[PDB]
Specification:
The structure is cut from a larger assembly and holds 2 copies of chain A (49 residues). Chain A is an all-alpha fold and 49 residues long. Helix content of chain A is 88%, strand content 0%. The radius of gyration of chain A is 20 Å and the shape is rod-shaped. Chain A: This is Spike protein S2'. It is classed as viral protein/immune system.
């Protein structure tokens, strides 16, 4: 944003947005899988109690 | 919905400044098009007139 004008800056900002959005989506998907695993473990622990 | 026709006479080699996202003297201080400009730029030599 300091080096480039808006029309030139936008194409770089779009690449960064796509990369960071993909990283965040990957993180959220991994957290969903881990949450399912932990939910299974917690149900097992509740049954054991 | 509507069409706006902007008419002016410009010097030759600076005619390229009339386009989206351009920088240059006419584009800076005389006639700035928006970066998302939708339309057509039409020009012709007018040394005869």
């Amino acid at each position: 944003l300091s080096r480039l004008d808006p029309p030139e800056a936008e194409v770089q900002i779009d690449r960064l947005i796509t990369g960071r959005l993909q990283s965040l989506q990957t993180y959220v998907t991994q957290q969903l899988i881990r949450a399912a695993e932990i939910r299974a473990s917690a149900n097992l622990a509740a049954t054991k109690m | 919905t509507n069409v706006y026709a902007d008419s002016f006479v410009i010097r030759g080699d600076e005619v390229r400044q009339i386009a989206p996202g351009q920088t240059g003297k006419i584009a800076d201080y005389n006639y700035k098009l928006p970066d998302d400009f939708t339309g057509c730029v039409i020009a012709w030599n007018s040394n005869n007139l």
